[PDB]
Write the structure tokens for this entry.
Amino acid sequence: GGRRFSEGTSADREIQRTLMELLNQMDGFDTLHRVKMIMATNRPDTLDPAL
Amino acid sequence: KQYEKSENDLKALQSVGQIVGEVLKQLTEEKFIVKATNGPRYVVGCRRQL
Amino acid sequence: RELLKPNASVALHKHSNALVDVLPPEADSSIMMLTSDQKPDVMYADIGGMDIQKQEVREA
Amino acid sequence: MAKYYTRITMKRMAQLLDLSVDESEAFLSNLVVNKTIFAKVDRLAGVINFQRPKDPNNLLNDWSQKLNSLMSLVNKTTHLIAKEEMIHNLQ
Amino acid sequence: ELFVMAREHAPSIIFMDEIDSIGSSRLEGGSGGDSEVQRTMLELLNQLDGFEATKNIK
Amino acid sequence: MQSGIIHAAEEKDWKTAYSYFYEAFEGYDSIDSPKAITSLKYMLLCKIMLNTPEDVQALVSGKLALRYAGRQTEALKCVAQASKNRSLADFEKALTDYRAELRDDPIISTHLAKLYDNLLEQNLIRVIEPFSRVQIEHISSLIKLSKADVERKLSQMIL
Amino acid sequence: DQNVNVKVIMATNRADTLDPALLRPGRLDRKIEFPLPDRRQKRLIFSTITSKMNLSEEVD
């Protein structure tokens, strides 16, 4: 989980994409009832403003 | 016991390690589109025993 | 061979080299879809608010 | 009773139940609602119809089904007959 | 690469629209990522081979 | 009040409509206008729509209703009574007097037509279903009409 | 676009999300804006959602 980034490495396009998936699962077309998630995070300001 | 094991083993030896795939879209029973793991997507049939 | 020319899925033989048939552009799709499954916690009826916005979505 | 008899008079049904025509009418009203078997019942007293739509369609499909099975039957029976026919090995 | 392809199937008019809404560290490279490209292309192409007063890929 | 009409008649969201009408009612109490009475109809109307006639009776808010009392207030309750009874006749009678109210607001006209027609339909389905060549007295009796009146209305329905 | 289907609907959460090829004047005729703080909407969301789930006798 991160942000858009992407004026650098091939790693940077990759974090934003993976982030997209965590958003949907939390709520964006898929809702938690069948699978539940608890996220353990070191630094909460790394994540998306959406997340 | 070894006879049964080897006879079943010959049948394994003539038989190859067939392509694994996934069903991209089933149009109908007789034409299924698959994504094969070798690369090229194929049109495949089905057997009636399924 | 007049319904041959559009860009759509098709079949070719490996080495019996024939364009054997044509297939719909529907075929070839690995994307899933949820028409309304895992239903959001919102609806048009389950809000009354964002009225100013209710015209902008309705149209689009 | 309803499944076997395509048609019964209201009157005959009373003799069969050993209850009057009026009582049978009320039972059928309740029965058709549960939807255990479909019936059409008349208050005229003419007939009680079970499993009939009054279309020629039914008769046309039914007619075909009996003929379709029959062909299949003749060809299988003759295979076994061929064994009997040989004789001097049974007798 | 763009010049060689354009030259091969010539003539061409290369319409470079420099909106320059790219970057936030390409706007410190020339004031557009595209404007950096265009300066490279401009100076080079003027001088290149005989293509200055024989120029036809504008 | 107005967002509620569109939701109820066109988009068929009675829940959102009910909720709208409540807010509107509260605002109407300070003034007297023709607009205030149109708000009173609508809250009652949503319940009748649900097809629980009890809710209608539970709900009544006298605050705007009494000022305006006459034919418009009573109409929503009579319609409910009718739905409860499963009588076409109660509904049938009421509707003629009520037509000025029908003209006045769109919401009532359309929903009352759905209700009348629906009720006829319910009553009729149960009558045909176990009996073919069913007696006239039996349809007159279930619907709650006279023999002449049901046959007439039926003519239209067959068509 | 100009099909029975809805034209591609997009959302962006940044000014760096976009690409100048996408951005170009002569592609976007339409601009859908979106507020959200208004006093009205807040009452409307609350009453419809409250009404979605069951009613209490302490409902206000």
Chain C is about 15% helix and 5% strand.
